[PDB]
């Protein structure tokens, strides 16, 4: 909720449509963070297709910067609801106001020159709660195409490779999500007839956790077990 | 074959990449000496692979390569006392992008220093003319012991304090030790302290602290 | 020549979060370092109790959403985060909460083994929107020190929380005078202090006197060259 | 009218307020301006540099 | 693993020849070494119990601001010179001697009557310097005891009494490292006294006062 505001940060946040608008004034009925249930006031409700509003929140999916965004619900149940405005909040947005940063207590001076041309200073009780933190997401993407010699199999069974390479992976040769994976850990398993070993991985120097695996199929094939 | 951009002259005699090269983005650490420069401890693994190699199979820790190959990787207790003998004396070359005048390349020797960011000295940075805006430094390191002889005695720091262009020492204090050291030499007419005498300096940091 | 030595002359528990000490007799120049010296230790280095592990039958990995809760999975373990609890006998336990039904969701809910105890039961962890859907989760806390993230130290369905091991957040120190006592000069020093409840103030200061000590007896173990 | 609120508030008019070192344990002379700034975290991180 | 912390012990002592000293220890608590470190400053500077000059008095002046024919030396000069003399003494508080001489050249602290209890630690200290053959320096000088510093104004002429033995301290901290251990502190410790006792034992001193001071806790 950045303290020093301008006033613009409600235009910004409401046209902005990171967050969830009200199309219509009322009373929300279910709240989750799934989804919400409005049902409309019979008089903003037309006579005809009256019915009841359900908004969906955009989840935990990628950027285009790689990071993270999500929608989160900001509103508790049977809670009066006005036309026009926030239901749930998306990045960066508090109660329907743009929030890029953090407001912290801050003091002007030379700090055992630590902070010699620009060198900000910062206590470890900042980052102890955490409100710097940032989640970033990874796709990585692999193919199955049809060289001479056979095609690109997906197969767990891979030549000259430890078990505990093999043990994160599933039936097929994919990884189970949610798991721990380090740089340098297979996550599908490639191989190219011959056979040889051309499995993914995770790039070098990278941690991180699988949230999920998208898998589409060239019209005409059959599909793994996963 | 000879002309053109991908002539040979062209193609392979100019700005050319260079293995066993790192960059990142730089810090102060002041406590460090102008004699010596800060490097985070990641850099300074995948930097000296072979040099850690050769000093465990010195050691017959593995005597394979790649099993020696696999300890390290591994990040297993011992490699950082050899990362600590090899960086015993081992001096490096510390570069910035815009390497306008010659102090832009520079010799230091690493500290091994935890983070994700170079430690600087300070002073020197005006020679580099880099603020810590975000500015991403470069870092090489020398091979032969005559390369190494070269940079710890011809761009080693200690050589390089004055300018080419002239005389002025180069690492002249830049904006705010200026300010404490300006805030020494000024007198407040009446305060504590004002009007006794003293036999030394040492009595007058005890009376000061 | 000599150096009276203070005593712990009060302790009163001004609010049931927080306290208030005094020392007495001090002499002069021992107040602020005794006072910077015990406020930097009392902020540095102290037992913990911090939250180590959760674990939800429901949840795959973290990132998911859980139907029928509101909140996110992270801003959850953000709450749990803000859970204190204490201990006494074991260095580990393993706290159990299960819950459904619409309405709010505190600490109140969670297992009341013996030497596990909430200090703050109100702390609210999350709500609940859905008449059926249990939340149902084990809590592996142990003891610690200082601040360990979850990359330091590093099962799917175990999911990793980092580290918070510090009971208390504001200090602060006065020097003032002491009564006549016959001698002029005499200082005493209050220590003003915030917890979330789950250390004594006494308890605090002599295991700073402890750590402080045995730090001191390298001084005195000062041996050699 | 900063100086009004600041006379709502507790805090001093200047808003310079005197600092106790860490380290030393004792005043700043000449005490200082200290506040809230909203800081931002810029999208260069130094691991992906 | 809670209580527990590592231990450091002093790697080495680099002390230069008579007073002058520098201390080395490591590895040390993230921390740690800042607040022992200005512990020791702040407690060597300030209770330190010693004995040290408190005043002065010449048989033929009243007056701060004159001088004796036959001196090089200013009575101000010389108080300077006084006030840089070490002595230590006997359990005895305070006590009178006298730098009674007749004489031309310098006057040494050597030159000083011994006076049983007390005795000088640096004898070849310069006093005054003497010229004349006729003239002759003769006074009073009171020695006390004490553990702080007097300045004239906290009060036959004056002396501040410098009761702390140590000149001057200070103390820095770099990271040290363990195989693993990603931050301790090693603490660098430069000292200098007068003399009057060596550098290690005022620090152990400064640590019995501490350590006593908190024996009433634990």
């Known amino acids: 909720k950045p303290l020093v505001g301008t006033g613009m940060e409600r235009a910004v946040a409401v046209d902005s449509g990171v967050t969830a608008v009200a199309k219509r004034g009322g009373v929300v009925q279910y709240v989750d963070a799934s989804r919400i249930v409005i049902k409309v006031n019979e008089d903003e409700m037309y006579p005809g297709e009256a019915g009841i509003d359900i908004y969906n929140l955009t989840k935990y999916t990628r950027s285009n910067q790689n990071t993270c965004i999500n929608q989160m619900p900001c509103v508790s149940l049977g809670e009066p609801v006005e036309r026009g405005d926030v239901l749930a909040d998306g990045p960066s947005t508090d109660l329907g106001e743009l929030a890029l940063g953090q407001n912290m207590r801050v003091a002007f001076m030379p700090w055992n020159g630590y902070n010699f041309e620009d060198s900000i200073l910062v206590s470890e009780r900042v980052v102890q709660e955490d409100r710097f933190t940032t989640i970033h997401i990874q796709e990585l993407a692999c193919v199955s195409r049809d060289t001479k010699l056979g095609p690109e199999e997906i197969t767990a069974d891979i030549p000259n490779v430890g078990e505990a390479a093999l043990s994160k992976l599933d039936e097929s040769g994919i990884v189970y999500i949610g798991a721990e994976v380090t740089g340098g850990d297979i996550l599908v398993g490639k191989v190219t007839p011959k056979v040889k070993d051309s499995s993914l991985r995770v790039p070098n120097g990278v941690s991180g956790t699988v949230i999920d695996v998208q898998v589409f199929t060239r019209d005409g094939v059959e599909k793994d077990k996963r | 074959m000879i002309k053109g951009k991908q002539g040979r002259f062209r193609q392979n005699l100019l700005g050319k990449r260079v293995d066993y090269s790192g960059r990142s983005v730089i810090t102060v650490g002041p406590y460090l000496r102008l004699h010596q420069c800060g490097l985070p401890k990641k850099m300074a693994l995948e930097l000296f692979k072979p040099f850690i190699y050769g000093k465990l199979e010195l050691r017959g820790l593995a005597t394979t390569i790649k099993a020696a190959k696999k300890m390290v990787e591994r990040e297993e207790a011992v490699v950082w006392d050899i990362l600590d003998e090899v960086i015993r004396e081992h001096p490096v070359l510390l570069n910035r992008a815009p390497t306008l005048h010659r102090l832009g390349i520079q010799a230091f020797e690493p500290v091994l220093i935890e983070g994700k960011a170079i430690q600087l000295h300070p002073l020197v940075c005006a020679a580099y003319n880099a603020d810590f805006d975000g500015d991403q430094m470069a870092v090489h390191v020398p091979l032969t012991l005559e390369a190494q002889l070269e940079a710890r005695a011809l761009m080693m720091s200690t050589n390089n304090i004055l300018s080419p262009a002239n005389g002025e020492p180069i690492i002249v204090p830049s904006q705010d030790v200026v300010l404490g050291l300006y805030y020494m030499t000024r007198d407040c007419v009446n305060a504590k302290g004002e009007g006794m005498v003293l036999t030394g300096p040492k009595e007058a940091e005890r009376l000061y602290r | ?225 | ?49």
């Open chain 3, 1 to 225: 020549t000599e150096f009276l030595k203070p005593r712990l002359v009060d302790i009163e528990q001004v609010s049931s979060t927080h306290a208030k000490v005094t020392l007495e007799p001090l002499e002069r120049g021992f107040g602020h370092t005794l006072g910077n010296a015990l406020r930097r230790i009392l902020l540095s280095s102290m037992p913990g109790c911090a939250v180590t592990e959760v674990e939800i039958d429901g949840v795959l990995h973290e990132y998911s959403t859980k139907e029928g809760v509101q909140e996110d999975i992270l801003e959850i373990l953000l709450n749990l985060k803000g859970l204190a609890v204490r201990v006494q006998g074991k260095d580990e336990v393993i706290l159990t909460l299960n819950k459904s039904g619409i309405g709010p969701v505190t600490a109140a809910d969670i297992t009341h083994d013996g030497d596990v105890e909430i200090v703050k039961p109100q702390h609210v962890i999350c709500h609940l929107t859905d008449e059926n859907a249990s939340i149902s989760m084990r809590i592996k806390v142990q003891r610690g020190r200082g601040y360990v993230p979850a990359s330091t130290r590093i099962p799917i369905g175990r999911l990793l929380v980092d580290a918070c091991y510090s009971p208390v957040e504001r200090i602060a120190y006065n020097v003032e005078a002491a009564r006549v006592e016959q001698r002029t000069d005499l200082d005493k020093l209050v220590i003003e202090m915030e917890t979330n409840g789950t250390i004594d103030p006494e308890e605090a200061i002599r295991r700073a006197a402890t750590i402080l000590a045995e730090q001191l007896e390298a001084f005195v173990d000062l041996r050699d060259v």
């Open chain 4, 1 to 49: 009218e900063i100086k009004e609120l600041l006379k709502l508030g507790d805090l001093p008019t200047s808003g310079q307020i005197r600092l106790y070192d860490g380290r030393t344990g004792e005043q700043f002379e000449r005490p200082v301006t200290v506040g809230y700034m909203y800081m931002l975290k810029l999208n260069h991180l130094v691991d992906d540099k």
